[PDB]
Curated annotation (Swiss-Prot), chains A, B:
Monomer, dimer, trimer, tetramer and pentamer, disulfide-linked or non-covalently associated, in homomeric and heteromeric combinations. Can also form a complex either with GHBP or with the alpha2-macroglobulin complex. The lineage of its organism: Eukaryota, Metazoa, Chordata, Craniata, Vertebrata. Circulating GH shows a great heterogeneity due to alternative splicing, differential post-translational modifications of monomeric forms, oligomerization, optional binding to 2 different GH-binding proteins, and potentially proteolytic processing. It comes from Homo sapiens (Human). Keywords: Disease variant, Disulfide bond, Dwarfism, Hormone, Metal-binding, Pharmaceutical, Phosphoprotein, Secreted, Signal, Zinc. The modification Phosphoserine is found at S106. This is Somatotropin.
Length: 166, 166
């Protein structure tokens, strides 16, 4: 019989996603500020290179109220597919993180951090059943780690701590 | 000549403190919920065992407005003394973290995390120049890591990102 309570599993799964989202956000801002000229920042803002996004194909909830309509198993399933589409892609971001001065980026094996989160999500389901290319992929990485972090904070808030927030 | 900008050093110093504060808070709640009977939670709330706190002696700002009056070098000096008073004490919390199910507690060498933050703070200054005993110490650890995190988010907000918040 499983010996870790469901609420701890949802908490731990959200903490891992939040860490990956901080790492994705801060290395995305340091990169943009160090290397992308202002000219190119506004351009990409108005036309994102979502072709670079590995996850383009996975249908996700568009607003917080479409997110609230989704069941916990549905939100877990969507989070798993978004982590699974990054498992091979993230190797390309290795040089970004190796060059980053953001605490913990350079000595993080980000492939492992994602494999750990994918196993975290599967375990929860079982209980309930150069520059501009690096920049576009860091944008998509940040966009996706932001969603996963939101889908796991919702499941966490609806699960054994039935009042968590953000 | 120093090659990491002051704002990155203040950011990194705040990220390390925030991580230690999350770790201190979550292992304090898991411990309290797993092991301290409700009876003893209210009692300690109304009479904290601050004798257990290594930092009792260090004078800190009492409210956010006494914090705002302090200079950055003063707030750095106070944060350093609070990290330095934990360097020998934290070894006693080893079994707590080894038993914790909170992500990252059990394989963290928390002594090292504090030595890294102490060196972070010294570098910034140079630019500007069983159960109830474990519970009391985890309370003090959380109280102090909360302050350090606040003093470093203030310095960070006043330093090269002269508009950061929390």
């Amino acid at each position: 019989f499983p010996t870790i309570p469901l609420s701890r599993l949802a908490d731990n799964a959200w903490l891992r996603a939040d860490r990956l989202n901080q790492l994705a956000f801060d290395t995305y801002q340091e990169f943009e500020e160090a290397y992308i000229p202002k000219e190119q920042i506004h351009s990409f803002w108005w036309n994102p290179q979502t072709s670079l996004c590995p996850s383009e194909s996975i249908p996700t909830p568009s607003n917080k109220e479409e997110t609230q309509q989704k069941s916990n198993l549905e939100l877990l399933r969507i989070s798993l597919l978004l982590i699974q589409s990054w498992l091979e892609p993230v190797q390309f971001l290795r040089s970004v993180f190796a060059n980053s001065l953001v605490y913990g980026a350079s000595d993080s094996n980000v492939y492992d951090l994602l494999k750990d989160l994918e196993e975290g999500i599967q375990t929860l389901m079982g209980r309930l059943e150069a520059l501009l290319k690096n920049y576009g992929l860091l944008y998509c990485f940040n966009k996706d780690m932001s969603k996963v972090s939101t889908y796991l904070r919702t499941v966490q808030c609806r699960s054994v701590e039935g009042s968590c927030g953000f």
